[PDB]
Protein backbone atom coordinates (compact mmCIF):
# COMPACT_ATOMS: atom_id res chain seq x y z
CA UNK A 1 0.00 0.00 0.00
CA UNK A 2 0.79 3.77 -0.14
CA UNK A 3 3.03 5.29 2.59
CA UNK A 4 3.23 9.14 2.53
CA UNK A 5 6.94 10.22 2.75
CA UNK A 6 8.61 13.59 3.09
CA UNK A 7 11.95 14.95 2.01
CA UNK A 8 14.81 13.97 4.30
CA UNK A 9 15.11 17.31 6.21
CA UNK A 10 11.30 17.18 6.95
CA UNK A 11 11.32 13.38 7.58
CA UNK A 12 13.88 14.01 10.40
CA UNK A 13 12.85 17.39 11.81
CA UNK A 14 9.02 16.67 11.90
CA UNK A 15 9.82 14.28 14.83
CA UNK A 16 11.16 17.22 16.92
CA UNK A 17 8.85 19.44 19.03
CA UNK A 18 10.26 22.69 17.48
CA UNK A 19 9.44 21.76 13.84
CA UNK A 20 7.88 24.59 11.75
CA UNK A 21 5.51 23.28 8.98
CA UNK A 22 6.91 25.87 6.50
CA UNK A 23 5.27 28.38 4.13
CA UNK A 24 4.23 25.85 1.44
CA UNK A 25 0.48 25.61 2.14
CA UNK A 26 0.07 22.70 -0.42
CA UNK A 27 2.38 20.48 1.72
CA UNK A 28 0.37 20.86 4.95
CA UNK A 29 -2.23 18.15 4.07
CA UNK A 30 0.56 15.65 3.26
CA UNK A 31 2.38 16.58 6.47
CA UNK A 32 -0.81 15.82 8.45
CA UNK A 33 -1.44 12.45 6.67
CA UNK A 34 2.21 11.59 7.31
CA UNK A 35 1.60 12.23 11.01
CA UNK A 36 -1.68 10.27 11.21
CA UNK A 37 0.06 7.35 9.44
CA UNK A 38 3.10 7.16 11.81
CA UNK A 39 1.32 7.96 15.13
CA UNK A 40 -1.94 5.97 14.47
CA UNK A 41 -1.29 3.64 11.46
CA UNK A 42 -1.96 3.43 7.67
CA UNK A 43 -5.14 1.52 8.81
CA UNK A 44 -6.70 4.15 11.19
CA UNK A 45 -8.52 5.98 8.33
CA UNK A 46 -9.50 5.19 4.73
CA UNK A 47 -7.17 7.51 2.75
CA UNK A 48 -9.94 8.80 0.37
CA UNK A 49 -12.28 9.78 3.30
CA UNK A 50 -9.33 11.27 5.28
CA UNK A 51 -8.15 13.43 2.28
CA UNK A 52 -11.77 14.60 1.73
CA UNK A 53 -12.13 15.40 5.49
CA UNK A 54 -8.76 17.39 5.64
CA UNK A 55 -9.72 19.43 2.55
CA UNK A 56 -13.21 20.29 3.97
CA UNK A 57 -11.53 21.25 7.28
CA UNK A 58 -9.11 23.56 5.41
CA UNK A 59 -12.03 25.19 3.50
CA UNK A 60 -13.78 26.02 6.84
CA UNK A 61 -10.75 27.90 8.31
CA UNK A 62 -10.80 31.62 7.37
CA UNK A 63 -8.00 33.83 6.06
CA UNK A 64 -7.33 35.58 9.42
CA UNK A 65 -3.78 36.45 10.58
CA UNK A 66 -3.37 33.83 13.39
CA UNK A 67 -6.44 31.47 13.87
CA UNK A 68 -5.99 29.94 10.40
CA UNK A 69 -5.32 26.60 8.71
CA UNK A 70 -1.50 26.91 9.38
CA UNK A 71 -2.28 27.21 13.17
CA UNK A 72 -4.43 24.06 13.01
CA UNK A 73 -1.68 21.93 11.41
CA UNK A 74 0.96 23.45 13.74
CA UNK A 75 -1.18 22.49 16.78
CA UNK A 76 -1.65 18.94 15.29
CA UNK A 77 2.16 18.59 14.74
CA UNK A 78 2.85 19.47 18.44
CA UNK A 79 0.24 16.75 19.41
CA UNK A 80 1.95 14.29 17.00
CA UNK A 81 5.30 15.03 18.78
CA UNK A 82 3.74 14.49 22.24
CA UNK A 83 2.04 11.23 21.13
CA UNK A 84 5.25 9.85 19.51
CA UNK A 85 7.41 10.62 22.60
CA UNK A 86 4.79 8.90 24.93
CA UNK A 87 3.93 5.91 22.66
CA UNK A 88 2.55 3.60 25.35
CA UNK A 89 0.36 5.98 27.52
CA UNK A 90 -2.43 6.54 24.95
CA UNK A 91 -5.23 4.33 23.66
CA UNK A 92 -5.97 3.64 19.96
CA UNK A 93 -9.06 5.91 20.11
CA UNK A 94 -7.04 8.70 21.80
CA UNK A 95 -4.35 8.48 19.07
CA UNK A 96 -7.07 8.75 16.29
CA UNK A 97 -9.15 11.43 18.06
CA UNK A 98 -6.51 13.90 19.35
CA UNK A 99 -4.78 14.66 15.96
CA UNK A 100 -8.28 15.18 14.51
CA UNK A 101 -9.27 17.37 17.50
CA UNK A 102 -6.15 19.49 16.99
CA UNK A 103 -6.75 19.94 13.21
CA UNK A 104 -10.37 20.98 14.00
CA UNK A 105 -9.95 22.96 17.28
CA UNK A 106 -10.27 26.48 15.80
CA UNK A 107 -12.67 25.60 12.91
CA UNK A 108 -14.46 28.68 11.43
CA UNK A 109 -12.66 31.13 13.74
CA UNK A 110 -13.29 34.80 12.89
CA UNK A 111 -10.20 36.30 14.70
CA UNK A 112 -12.28 37.51 17.71
CA UNK A 113 -12.37 36.34 21.34
CA UNK A 114 -15.33 34.83 23.24
CA UNK A 115 -15.47 38.19 25.04
CA UNK A 116 -15.84 40.30 21.81
CA UNK A 117 -18.69 38.01 20.59
CA UNK A 118 -20.50 38.48 23.97
CA UNK A 119 -20.15 42.31 23.77
CA UNK A 120 -21.16 42.51 20.06
CA UNK A 121 -24.13 40.16 20.90
CA UNK A 122 -23.20 37.74 18.11
CA UNK A 123 -25.80 35.00 17.59
CA UNK A 124 -23.20 32.30 18.73
CA UNK A 125 -23.08 34.07 22.17
CA UNK A 126 -26.80 33.17 22.67
CA UNK A 127 -26.42 29.57 21.39
CA UNK A 128 -23.28 29.05 23.70
CA UNK A 129 -23.05 31.11 26.96
CA UNK A 130 -19.44 29.99 27.83
CA UNK A 131 -16.56 28.67 25.72
CA UNK A 132 -18.54 30.27 22.85
CA UNK A 133 -16.13 29.72 19.90
CA UNK A 134 -14.98 26.29 21.25
CA UNK A 135 -18.57 24.94 21.24
CA UNK A 136 -18.78 26.34 17.69
CA UNK A 137 -15.47 24.65 16.69
CA UNK A 138 -16.77 21.23 17.96
CA UNK A 139 -20.14 21.88 16.16
CA UNK A 140 -18.26 22.60 12.83
CA UNK A 141 -16.31 19.35 13.40
CA UNK A 142 -19.48 17.16 13.70
CA UNK A 143 -20.95 19.02 10.63
CA UNK A 144 -17.92 18.09 8.46
CA UNK A 145 -17.86 14.47 9.83
CA UNK A 146 -21.49 14.15 8.65
CA UNK A 147 -20.95 15.26 5.02
CA UNK A 148 -21.22 12.45 2.42
CA UNK A 149 -17.90 10.51 2.23
CA UNK A 150 -16.29 12.44 5.18
CA UNK A 151 -16.91 9.95 8.02
CA UNK A 152 -13.32 8.96 8.82
CA UNK A 153 -14.71 7.12 11.91
CA UNK A 154 -17.08 4.82 9.80
CA UNK A 155 -15.00 1.67 10.76
CA UNK A 156 -15.57 2.32 14.57
CA UNK A 157 -18.43 0.64 16.58
CA UNK A 158 -21.36 2.79 17.86
CA UNK A 159 -19.69 3.01 21.34
CA UNK A 160 -16.13 3.54 19.99
CA UNK A 161 -17.62 6.26 17.68
CA UNK A 162 -19.32 7.88 20.71
CA UNK A 163 -16.13 7.70 22.85
CA UNK A 164 -13.92 9.28 20.10
CA UNK A 165 -16.46 12.21 19.52
CA UNK A 166 -16.38 12.65 23.31
CA UNK A 167 -12.51 12.78 23.41
CA UNK A 168 -12.69 15.38 20.54
CA UNK A 169 -15.37 17.46 22.31
CA UNK A 170 -13.47 17.60 25.60
CA UNK A 171 -10.12 18.20 23.77
CA UNK A 172 -11.62 21.19 21.83
CA UNK A 173 -13.45 22.68 24.90
CA UNK A 174 -10.10 22.51 26.83
CA UNK A 175 -8.56 25.00 24.28
CA UNK A 176 -10.65 27.74 25.95
CA UNK A 177 -7.74 29.36 27.82
CA UNK A 178 -10.30 30.63 30.52
CA UNK A 179 -10.56 26.89 31.57
CA UNK A 180 -6.78 26.16 31.50
CA UNK A 181 -5.94 27.95 34.84
CA UNK A 182 -8.20 25.79 37.11
CA UNK A 183 -7.43 22.67 35.04
CA UNK A 184 -3.63 23.09 35.56
CA UNK A 185 -4.17 23.84 39.34
CA UNK A 186 -6.16 20.60 39.79
CA UNK A 187 -3.50 18.63 37.87
CA UNK A 188 -0.64 20.31 39.85
CA UNK A 189 -2.30 19.35 43.22
CA UNK A 190 -3.14 15.79 41.97
CA UNK A 191 0.53 15.24 40.86
CA UNK A 192 1.99 16.67 44.17
CA UNK A 193 -0.29 14.74 46.61
CA UNK A 194 0.31 11.58 44.43
CA UNK A 195 -3.48 11.17 43.74
CA UNK A 196 -2.92 11.54 39.93
CA UNK A 197 -4.15 8.27 38.35
CA UNK A 198 -4.33 7.76 34.54
CA UNK A 199 -6.83 4.83 34.87
CA UNK A 200 -9.21 7.46 36.29
CA UNK A 201 -11.09 8.72 33.13
CA UNK A 202 -11.68 12.21 34.70
CA UNK A 203 -7.85 12.41 35.30
CA UNK A 204 -7.11 11.35 31.67
CA UNK A 205 -9.57 14.12 30.55
CA UNK A 206 -7.56 16.74 32.53
CA UNK A 207 -4.14 15.51 31.22
CA UNK A 208 -5.54 15.62 27.60
CA UNK A 209 -6.88 19.18 28.24
CA UNK A 210 -3.37 20.26 29.37
CA UNK A 211 -1.80 18.57 26.23
CA UNK A 212 -4.35 20.66 24.25
CA UNK A 213 -3.34 24.00 25.86
CA UNK A 214 0.32 22.99 25.33
CA UNK A 215 -0.21 22.23 21.61
CA UNK A 216 -2.33 25.41 21.18
CA UNK A 217 0.41 27.64 22.72
CA UNK A 218 3.32 25.81 20.91
CA UNK A 219 4.49 28.98 18.95
CA UNK A 220 6.34 29.86 22.24
CA UNK A 221 8.33 26.50 21.86
CA UNK A 222 9.73 27.28 18.38
CA UNK A 223 13.02 28.75 17.11
CA UNK A 224 13.03 32.41 18.23
CA UNK A 225 12.44 33.87 14.68
CA UNK A 226 9.27 31.64 14.44
CA UNK A 227 8.10 32.67 17.94
CA UNK A 228 8.70 36.34 17.21
CA UNK A 229 7.01 36.38 13.71
CA UNK A 230 4.05 34.37 15.03
CA UNK A 231 3.67 36.95 17.85
CA UNK A 232 3.08 39.66 15.16
CA UNK A 233 0.18 37.56 13.74
CA UNK A 234 -1.23 37.01 17.25
CA UNK A 235 -1.27 40.78 18.00
CA UNK A 236 -2.57 41.57 14.42
CA UNK A 237 -5.80 39.80 15.53
CA UNK A 238 -5.91 41.27 19.09
CA UNK A 239 -5.46 44.83 17.73
CA UNK A 240 -8.25 44.39 15.09
CA UNK A 241 -10.51 43.16 18.01
CA UNK A 242 -9.40 46.25 20.05
CA UNK A 243 -10.45 48.51 17.10
CA UNK A 244 -13.86 46.71 17.02
CA UNK A 245 -14.18 47.21 20.84
CA UNK A 246 -13.62 50.99 20.32
CA UNK A 247 -16.28 50.89 17.53
CA UNK A 248 -18.72 49.53 20.15
CA UNK A 249 -17.66 52.51 22.38
CA UNK A 250 -15.53 50.33 24.75
CA UNK A 251 -11.85 50.92 25.78
CA UNK A 252 -10.30 47.52 24.98
CA UNK A 253 -8.00 45.72 27.51
CA UNK A 254 -4.35 46.81 26.93
CA UNK A 255 -3.55 43.45 25.13
CA UNK A 256 -5.90 44.54 22.32
CA UNK A 257 -4.98 48.25 22.13
CA UNK A 258 -2.58 48.88 19.15
CA UNK A 259 -1.75 52.22 20.93
CA UNK A 260 0.09 50.13 23.67
CA UNK A 261 2.35 48.40 21.03
CA UNK A 262 5.40 49.39 23.21
CA UNK A 263 4.26 47.15 26.17
CA UNK A 264 4.24 43.92 24.00
CA UNK A 265 7.62 42.66 25.35
CA UNK A 266 6.35 43.02 28.98
CA UNK A 267 2.93 41.48 27.97
CA UNK A 268 4.90 38.49 26.56
CA UNK A 269 6.82 38.10 29.92
CA UNK A 270 3.50 38.14 31.84
CA UNK A 271 2.10 35.50 29.43
CA UNK A 272 5.19 33.21 29.65
CA UNK A 273 5.20 33.46 33.50
CA UNK A 274 1.37 33.28 34.00
CA UNK A 275 0.44 30.77 31.25
CA UNK A 276 3.12 29.17 29.05
CA UNK A 277 5.87 28.24 31.59
CA UNK A 278 3.37 26.82 34.15
CA UNK A 279 1.64 24.86 31.29
CA UNK A 280 4.82 23.10 30.11
CA UNK A 281 6.13 22.69 33.72
CA UNK A 282 3.04 20.64 34.81
CA UNK A 283 3.07 18.87 31.39
CA UNK A 284 6.74 17.88 31.89
CA UNK A 285 6.03 16.63 35.48
CA UNK A 286 3.20 14.45 34.13
CA UNK A 287 4.90 13.29 30.85
CA UNK A 288 8.65 13.60 31.26
CA UNK A 289 9.51 13.15 27.56
CA UNK A 290 7.71 16.55 26.79
CA UNK A 291 10.62 18.42 28.48
CA UNK A 292 11.94 19.96 25.17
CA UNK A 293 8.74 22.12 25.09
CA UNK A 294 9.50 23.52 28.63
CA UNK A 295 13.18 24.01 27.63
CA UNK A 296 12.20 25.88 24.38
CA UNK A 297 9.57 28.09 26.18
CA UNK A 298 12.21 29.09 28.77
CA UNK A 299 14.67 29.98 25.94
CA UNK A 300 12.00 32.22 24.27
CA UNK A 301 11.19 33.88 27.67
CA UNK A 302 14.88 34.87 27.90
CA UNK A 303 14.71 36.16 24.22
CA UNK A 304 11.76 38.44 25.26
CA UNK A 305 13.82 39.52 28.29
CA UNK A 306 16.70 40.42 25.88
CA UNK A 307 14.21 42.47 23.81
CA UNK A 308 13.21 44.50 26.91
CA UNK A 309 16.96 45.08 27.78
CA UNK A 310 17.43 46.45 24.19
CA UNK A 311 19.88 43.57 23.27
CA UNK A 312 17.26 42.16 20.69
C1 LIG B 1 2.32 33.89 22.32
C2 LIG B 1 0.85 33.75 22.66
N3 LIG B 1 0.17 32.61 22.35
C4 LIG B 1 -1.16 32.46 22.62
C5 LIG B 1 -1.99 33.51 23.18
C6 LIG B 1 -3.44 33.27 23.50
N7 LIG B 1 -1.26 34.68 23.55
N8 LIG B 1 -1.69 35.81 24.10
C9 LIG B 1 -0.67 36.71 24.14
C10 LIG B 1 -0.89 38.07 24.71
C11 LIG B 1 0.11 38.20 25.82
C12 LIG B 1 -0.10 39.61 26.36
N13 LIG B 1 0.29 40.83 25.76
C14 LIG B 1 -0.24 41.75 26.63
N15 LIG B 1 -0.13 43.19 26.55
C16 LIG B 1 -0.34 43.95 27.85
C17 LIG B 1 0.19 45.35 27.75
C18 LIG B 1 -0.04 45.92 26.41
C19 LIG B 1 0.63 45.25 25.32
C20 LIG B 1 0.80 43.80 25.60
N21 LIG B 1 -0.88 41.17 27.67
N22 LIG B 1 -0.76 39.81 27.53
C23 LIG B 1 -1.33 38.79 28.36
N24 LIG B 1 0.45 36.14 23.62
C25 LIG B 1 0.06 34.87 23.26
MG1 LIG C 1 -9.24 28.55 19.96
ZN1 LIG D 1 -5.92 27.45 18.61
* Discontinuities in the chain (C→N > 2.5 Å), after residue: none
Name the residue among 158, 186, 161 with its Cα closest to residue 174.
Answer: 186
C-beta of 255 in contact with ligand 1 (< 6 A): yes
Active site residue 67: yes
CB 46 within 8 A of CB 110: no
The total number of residues shown for the chain amounts to 312
* 41 dihedral zone (left: phi>0; alpha: psi -120 to 50; beta): left
Domains and CATH numbers, the chain: 27-309 (1.10.1300.10)
Looking at the CA of 216, which ligand is closest? 3
Compute, in angstroms, the gap from residue 267 CA to the centroid of ligand 2: 19
CB 280 within 8 A of CB 290: yes
Based on the number of CB atoms within 10 Å of its own CB, is 193 exposed (0-12), middle (13-18) or buried (19 or more)? exposed
Distance, in Å, from the CA atom of 4 to the CA atom of 26, rounded to the nearest integer, reads 14
Count the alpha carbons within 13 Å of 43 in the hemisphere toward its beta carbon. Answer: 3
Compute, in angstroms, the gap from residue 238 CA to the centroid of ligand 1: 9
C-beta of 231 in contact with ligand 1 (< 6 A): yes
Kindly report the number of other CB atoms within 10 A of residue 100's CB atom: 31
205 is in an annotated binding site: no
Report the chain's C-alpha Rg in angstroms.
19
Looking at the CA of 261, which ligand is closest? 1
Distance, in Å, from the CA atom of 301 to the CA atom of 312, rounded to the nearest integer, reads 12
Nearest CA to ligand 1 atom 12: 267
CB 293 within 8 A of CB 221: yes
Distance, in Å, from the CA atom of 265 to the CA atom of 245, rounded to the nearest integer, reads 23
CB 185 within 8 A of CB 78: no
Q: How was this structure determined?
A: X-ray
DSSP calls for 120-159: HT-HHHHH-SSSHHHHHHHHHHHHHHTSTT--TTTTS-HH
Compute, in angstroms, the gap from residue 79 CA to the centroid of ligand 1: 23
C-beta of 267 in contact with ligand 1 (< 6 A): yes
Long-range contacts of 269-273 (CB under 8 A, 24+ apart): 269/301, 269/304, 269/305, 269/308, 272/220, 272/297, 272/300, 272/301, 272/304, 273/301
Of the candidates 18, 67, 109, 137, the residue annotated as catalytic is 67
Quote the Cα angle for 260-266-241, to 5°.
40
Amino acid sequence: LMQFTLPVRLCKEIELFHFDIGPFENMWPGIFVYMVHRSCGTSCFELEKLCRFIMSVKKNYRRVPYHNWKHAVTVAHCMYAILQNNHTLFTDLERKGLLIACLCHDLDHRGFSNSYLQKFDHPLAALYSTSTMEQHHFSQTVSILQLEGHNIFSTLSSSEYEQVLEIIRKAIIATDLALYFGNRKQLEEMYQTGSLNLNNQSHRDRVIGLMMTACDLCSVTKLWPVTKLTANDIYAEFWAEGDEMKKLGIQPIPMMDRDKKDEVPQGQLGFYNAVAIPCYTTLTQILPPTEPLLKACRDNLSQWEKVIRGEE
